[PDB]
Design a binder for these strands. Structure first.
Lengths: 48, 111, 127, 197, 106, 167
RNA sequence: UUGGCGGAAAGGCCUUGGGUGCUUGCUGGCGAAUUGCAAUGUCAUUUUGCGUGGGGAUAAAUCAUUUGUAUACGACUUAGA
RNA sequence: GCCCUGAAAAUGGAUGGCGCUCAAGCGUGUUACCUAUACUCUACCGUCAGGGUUGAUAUGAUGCCCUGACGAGUAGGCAGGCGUGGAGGUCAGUGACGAAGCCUAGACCGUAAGGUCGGGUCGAACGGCCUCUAGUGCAGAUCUUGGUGGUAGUAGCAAAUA
RNA sequence: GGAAUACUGCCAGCUGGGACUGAGGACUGCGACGUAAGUCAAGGAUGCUGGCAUAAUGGUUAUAUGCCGCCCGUCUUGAAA
RNA sequence: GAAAUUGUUGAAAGGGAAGGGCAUUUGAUCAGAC
């Protein structure tokens, strides 16, 4: 088995995105922010 | 040893190519009929063919003729020995012993 | 411009080093034959160092010949240099390590006059 | 002569193929092997299974993790049979084996390239008719290879795309095979025959 | 044309050796297309050049050549022994050499 | 002193060599070389150029020309071993070649003082060549496709075995 | 440039239109020289650096402090604009 | 005849390994081919043997040259040499304008012990040659004396209440 | 009844290709071709040409590769032990 | 003012030793003849 791809939600809660930071307090939190651009468009990046 | 009967051809090539004289207790190449004249002139031997004639026909002075010739130094046979193992009798599939005429074939490869 | 000589042949140029001279610091590299009962080098096993022997003796007609074609002859002063007056084509002069920097210019100026090749005409030159 | 020679192992004896591939690598020739699962080995199945269990006994007693690693996948089973015909502990032998790639089925790009066979290593030409042999794929899944079916399913999908490719190939060439015919018995065509072409 | 090759390919196979001892003064070369000593009989005396590359120029090129010639047949598959002016470095087992067609006999 | 002296000295007179017994004799070309033959050059700038053999010179060299108009090979001399001789032949009758000789090709090697830091043809050489080829080009015209043959380079392609091919 | 196909390691394959170069399918003209009788006679790919002018986005980790689901020490799990 | 049973030992394991089934096995035959310091021919080294050579100028008659054969080696014998301290003679030797020593993956000679040179260092004695003489040549002796390592910033520096 | 061919043997029969060697240094000897002159493959290589003339060949040194190589001294029949 | 033994700088190699022998590529370096 090899992981083909991953598709995340449009909005991620804070507590799940603390899992991606070792020093959460000093950070712009800067996660998936460019990945949210895949949403806000009907058929651009997600469904494909 | 591996011995046999040599023919005229076999003797002739040995002396012409590998013929060496034992003169003054030194091994000297023949390369000339005068050398034989100096030593073997006492028995009526003048040229290299006179010496060979004493070998092909075992003449009255064979011993003096034969002893004048150095022991020949031959090479390994050019085509191999023709057998897997040398040290079996020629009858038994090896090489040593009396082979009647096939010493001519062997010696020429050695020659 | 020395006399004609056959091509210089050495038959062995790597220096013979004593056995195990590289292993220990006390065993200096100057050759010494191994006399041991169980020495591999002494018995001449395969893959071991080679011992000096007369078969390595150089050709007599080119023995002692430096690459230039002249045999070397250490000289001490002008008188000793003159000994090579008539023999420039077989011998070369050499100035001893103890001949002073001021004296050396004396022999070179002379050797150039007689045309005798000096192997080391650069020692103790200040420039 | 090709920069890479791709070999289909099906119907080849594991050893004789391995020797031929072993010599080629040491000679600077690159080999890629595909469909290792259908390699053949002489002998019954239960005969060859036992030999593998004997190989499974040998392991370093005081620590198994360092002992002779017994690989199960057919590509590795063939690979072991070849590493022993290469001086693999020397820097030349490492260079020899890096010229080698062994595969299950025919993966990509090797699928769209010509595959050859080694006629001196073929089961049909070597073995006597009526003997008994094995198929490495049957054996490897019998000692712990977990991907017999994944290969089998994917390969059938491979052959499907190949079957139509032949169909376009054969249909297209047939039309080509006709145009040259009507170009025959021509002034150029007849004279090349005297030149043998 | 796209073909500009005026030699015959070959592979430097190994040194001349016994089971345990190799002789670095004589090399083993395989000429592709040759399968019998009779086929190889043609190439005897032909010139051989091993062309390699360096990172430093010697006389205006980054390319260097080691010359040599075919001495005699080896084996039964038409492998040939070649002795070089300077021995091939033994990291070229499997390297490609070039067997030029001169001195031609034809 | 440094070392005392060598007690004896060797002679410094160069000894004359013994009288040799090596006489030079005329060279024997292989039967494959006949004037008029088309050759393929194996070395030099013009390696792989099919070219015409005209004469056997004195110093074992083969006077050879393109002809120059066909492929651009002038009147040259090449070694008897650096050529490939074929079965194709072109007539050389009525062609004057006896004018050329060894001294005709004289280079006048430049002095060591002349050093090429960074950076021509004789007039008489060119008019010599145009004289010969005009008698040969017309001869080529009779055999079809020969003219294109002599303008075409030679090469070896894959699958081509020299020991098996025929030239 | 238009459209598809390929996930086993797809990184490739097919197809549409137009523009462009050459064409040895056939016939011609013009230059080859001098590398001096050979010298691989230098034509490939692998990485990196240094400037071009052309776009594009503007972070974390570790130490230190802290908890104890951790702990001989490192390590581990938490918290801290 | 081959094969099979009879045929059971202890770390995992050995036709040398891989591996081999009209064999890459067993029996038998014919060729081709591979390669030892062996055999042949040649060059060079040395030893031994047999010889030539007063001839002036020019040196060496222990010289120069010709001819043939031969070359393993512990214990052991003989011979030619290399090297060190000191002595008689010689070079009317080297040297404060740098002796001797010491360093030098810089140079040359000798098969070798060794010899010479260049650079660096330092500062006051030393060398070649013919002979004479010996407290004359070290890897070893659980060697003698002095010096120094790895172990290793390790063991540890924890009884008598703080 | 008459031949051919195989096999074995012989040629002081002819001829091609490939490799390694070039030792010796005035003449002297033995032979051949020639009427002679003289020539020669006959007691050991010369003739023609090119490039380079510098680190290019080569020495040494470190490393890389292929193959080989147990730690010396010692007593012992036997030592890497 | 040597060696053992050590510090810094420079160069090189390093998949359960290191070193050694025969040959050559590579880098460095160097002599002689012209």
């Amino acid at each position: 088995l090899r992981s083909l791809t991953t598709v995340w939600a449009e909005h991620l809660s804070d507590e799940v995105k603390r899992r991606f930071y070792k020093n959460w307090y000093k950070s712009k939190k800067k996660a998936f922010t460019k990945y949210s651009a895949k949403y806000a468009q009907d058929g651009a990046g997600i469904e494909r | 040893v591996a011995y046999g009967y040599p023919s005229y051809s076999t003797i002739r090539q040995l002396v012409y190519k590998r013929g060496f004289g034992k003169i003054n207790k030194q091994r000297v190449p023949l390369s000339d009929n005068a050398i034989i004249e100096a030593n073997l002139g006492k028995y009526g031997i003048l040229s290299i063919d006179d010496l060979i004639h004493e070998i092909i026909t075992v003449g009255p002075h064979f011993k003096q003729a034969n002893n004048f010739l150095w022991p020949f130094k031959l090479s390994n046979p050019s085509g191999g020995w023709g057998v897997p193992r040398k040290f079996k009798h020629f009858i038994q599939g090896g090489s040593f012993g009396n082979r009647e005429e096939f010493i001519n074939k062997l010696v020429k490869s050695m020659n | 411009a020395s006399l004609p000589h056959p091509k210089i042949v050495k038959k062995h140029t790597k220096k013979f080093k004593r056995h195990h001279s590289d292993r220990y610091h006390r065993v200096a590299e100057n050759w010494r034959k191994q006399k041991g009962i169980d020495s591999v080098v002494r018995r001449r096993f395969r893959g071991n160092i080679s011992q000096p022997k007369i078969g390595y003796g150089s050709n007599k007609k080119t023995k002692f010949l430096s690459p230039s074609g002249h045999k070397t002859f250490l000289v001490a002063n002008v008188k000793d240099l003159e000994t090579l007056t008539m023999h420039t084509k077989t011998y070369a002069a050499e100035i001893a390590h103890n001949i002073s920097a001021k004296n050396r210019v004396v022999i070179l100026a002379r050797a150039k006059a007689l045309g005798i090749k000096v192997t080391n005409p650069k020692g103790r030159l200040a420039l | 002569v090709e920069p890479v020679v791709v070999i289909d192992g099906k119907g080849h004896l594991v050893g004789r193929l391995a020797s031929v591939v072993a010599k080629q690598l040491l000679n600077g020739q690159k080999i890629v092997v595909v469909r290792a699962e259908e390699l053949n080995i002489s002998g019954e199945f239960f005969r060859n299974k036992l030999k593998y269990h004997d190989f499974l006994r040998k392991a370093t007693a005081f620590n198994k993790t360092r002992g002779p690693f017994h690989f199960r996948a057919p590509s590795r089973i063939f690979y072991k049979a070849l590493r022993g015909m290469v001086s693999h502990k020397t820097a030349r032998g490492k260079a020899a084996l890096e010229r080698l790639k062994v595969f299950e089925g025919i993966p990509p790009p090797y699928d769209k390239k010509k595959r050859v066979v080694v006629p001196q290593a073929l089961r049909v030409l070597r073995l006597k008719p009526g003997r008994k042999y094995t198929t490495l794929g049957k054996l490897s899944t019998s000692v712990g290879w977990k991907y017999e079916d994944v290969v089998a399913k994917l390969e059938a999908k491979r052959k499907v795309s190949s079957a139509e490719y032949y169909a376009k190939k054969r249909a297209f060439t047939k039309k080509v095979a006709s145009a040259n015919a009507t170009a025959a018995e021509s002034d150029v065509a007849k004279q090349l025959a005297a030149l043998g072409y | 044309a796209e073909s500009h090759r005026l030699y015959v390919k070959g592979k430097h196979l190994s040194y001349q050796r016994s089971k345990r001892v190799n002789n670095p003064n004589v090399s083993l070369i395989k000429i592709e297309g040759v399968a019998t000593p009779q086929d190889a009989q043609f190439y005897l005396g032909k010139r051989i050049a091993y062309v390699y590359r360096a990172s430093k120029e010697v006389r205006g090129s980054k390319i260097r050549v080691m010359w040599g010639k075919v001495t005699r047949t080896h084996g039964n598959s038409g492998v040939v022994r070649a002795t070089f002016r300077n021995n091939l470095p033994a990291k070229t087992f499997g390297a490609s050499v070039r067997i030029f067609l001169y001195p031609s006999n034809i | 002193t440094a070392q005392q002296a060598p007690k004896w000295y060797p002679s410094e007179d160069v000894a004359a060599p013994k009288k040799t017994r090596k006489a030079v004799r005329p060279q024997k070309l292989r039967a494959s070389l006949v004037p008029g033959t088309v050759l393929i050059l194996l070395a030099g700038r013009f390696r792989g150029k099919r070219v015409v053999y005209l004469k056997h010179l004195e110093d074992n060299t083969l006077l050879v020309t393109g002809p120059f108009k066909v492929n651009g090979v002038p009147l040259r001399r090449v070694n008897a071993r650096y050529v490939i001789a074929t079965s194709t032949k072109v007539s050389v009758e009525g062609v004057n070649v006896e004018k050329f000789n060894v001294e005709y090709f004289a280079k006048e090697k430049l002095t060591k003082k002349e050093k090429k830091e960074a950076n021509e043809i004789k007039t008489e050489r060119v008019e010599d060549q145009k004289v010969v080829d005009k008698a040969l080009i017309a001869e080529i015209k009779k055999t079809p496709l020969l003219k294109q043959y002599l303008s075409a380079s030679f090469s070896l392609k894959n699958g081509d075995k020299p020991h098996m091919l025929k030239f």
